Design an enzyme around this catalytic site. Structure first.
Site, mmCIF file in Angstrom:
data_model
loop_
_atom_site.group_PDB
_atom_site.id
_atom_site.type_symbol
_atom_site.label_atom_id
_atom_site.label_comp_id
_atom_site.label_asym_id
_atom_site.label_seq_id
_atom_site.Cartn_x
_atom_site.Cartn_y
_atom_site.Cartn_z
ATOM 1 C CG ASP A 13 -2.017 1.011 1.162
ATOM 2 O OD1 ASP A 13 -2.959 0.857 0.357
ATOM 3 O OD2 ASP A 13 -1.937 1.983 1.943
ATOM 4 C CD1 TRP A 14 -1.597 5.231 1.398
ATOM 5 C CD2 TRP A 14 0.054 6.429 0.470
ATOM 6 N NE1 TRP A 14 -2.173 6.227 0.651
ATOM 7 C CE2 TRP A 14 -1.187 6.977 0.064
ATOM 8 C CE3 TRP A 14 1.239 7.024 0.008
ATOM 9 C CZ2 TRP A 14 -1.277 8.094 -0.778
ATOM 10 C CZ3 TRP A 14 1.148 8.137 -0.835
ATOM 11 C CH2 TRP A 14 -0.107 8.657 -1.218
ATOM 12 C CG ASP A 51 -5.995 -5.634 -2.439
ATOM 13 O OD1 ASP A 51 -6.977 -4.994 -1.990
ATOM 14 O OD2 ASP A 51 -4.882 -5.111 -2.650
ATOM 15 C CG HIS A 90 -5.368 -3.460 0.809
ATOM 16 N ND1 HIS A 90 -4.749 -3.224 -0.401
ATOM 17 C CD2 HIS A 90 -5.137 -2.362 1.566
ATOM 18 C CE1 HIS A 90 -4.178 -2.034 -0.381
ATOM 19 N NE2 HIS A 90 -4.399 -1.492 0.804
#
Length: 310
Positions: A124-125, A260, A289
């Site tokens: 993710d980030w 995800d 995710h």
């Protein structure tokens, strides 16, 4: 100049399976008055160092199942909490959070701790930001473990890295909606939905960093940054592609959380092609995710893959 608040330490008293001792770095270059938390586990004089970067809307607690596996292999493990998350300080204004605010923080952390022989572990980030670090100081990075993530470049350059934003409706659109709309955001409820295999206790840990809404400016700004990418983010992300495609020559390992709805195969396969030498990805059928919740397996297979290529 950076009005922030600190989560009372009592909020972390009953954490589930998080016996890792706190380390803090105050006043990093460009971050005056801000205390950043990070874990430093395993041999501190270890040759290999696993930099584990979390995403939205979690913290280092996300890597709790991977940390022990990495430390046991004889490597050091660094798992920092972004400002606005975990035990790090939390700026009260959303305006204060930007792509470079978080990116520069990671660079300052790397220089301050003088990390070398780094195996970058992202999702993710942690990936949006993490994948842009190597090009700024290549000699420090050795390997990469990538789970559900990509680069925040523009729609024309890489349509796959923008398409997921609007479709499906129950993917990122729903994810972002749950985070930016509730006046009273409950991250324990959020995580139970987006990571259905979490226990009540584990879910509580994700709510722990935030006593109330005034502690969530960072949580509210991240999803908004995925939809509205500033020029700096676009350019840095675009330069990152060329690095992974032409400059990268380190060992890579990819794992995809197949369930995800945000950054699954649609995003991960085009990513695999952009990273030079990236092998066939480990498909995790049940993982969502938050691939890290199925991290012990990813951790073990990444180490096995790295050893066979030593």
């Amino acid at each position: 100049m950076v009005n922030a608040i600190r989560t009372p330490d009592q909020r972390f008293s009953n954490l589930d399976q998080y016996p890792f001792s706190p380390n803090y770095l105050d006043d990093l270059p460009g971050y005056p008055g801000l205390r950043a938390h990070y874990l430093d586990e395993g041999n501190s004089d270890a040759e290999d160092v696993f930099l584990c970067l979390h995403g939205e809307p979690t913290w280092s607690y996300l890597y709790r199942k991977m940390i022990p596996v990495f430390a046991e292999s004889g490597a050091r493990v660094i798992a920092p909490d972004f400002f606005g998350f975990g035990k790090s300080d939390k700026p009260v204004d959303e305006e204060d959070y930007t792509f470079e605010f978080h990116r520069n923080f990671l660079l300052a952390l790397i220089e301050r701790l003088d990390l070398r022989n780094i195996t970058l572990v992202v999702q993710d980030w942690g990936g949006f930001l993490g994948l842009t670090l190597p090009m700024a100081d290549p000699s420090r990075f050795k390997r990469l473990i990538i789970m559900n993530a990509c680069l925040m470049t523009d729609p024309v350059t890489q349509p796959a890295f923008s398409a997921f934003v609007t479709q499906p409706a129950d993917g990122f659109t729903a994810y972002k909606y749950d985070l930016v709309t509730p006046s009273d955001l409950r991250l324990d409820q959020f995580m139970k939905r987006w990571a259905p295999t979490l226990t009540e206790a584990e879910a509580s840990a994700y709510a722990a960093p935030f006593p109330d809404t005034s502690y969530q400016a960072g949580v509210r700004k991240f999803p908004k940054m995925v939809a509205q990418r500033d020029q700096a983010c676009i350019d840095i992300s675009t330069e990152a592609i060329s690095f992974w495609q032409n400059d990268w020559n380190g060992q890579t390992f990819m794992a995809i959380g197949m369930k995800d709805k945000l950054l699954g195969p649609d995003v991960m396969y085009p990513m695999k092609a952009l990273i030079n030498g990236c092998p066939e990805p480990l498909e995790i059928a049940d993982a969502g995710h938050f691939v890290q919740e199925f991290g012990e397996q990813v951790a073990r297979e990444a180490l096995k893959h790295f050893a066979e290529t030593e």
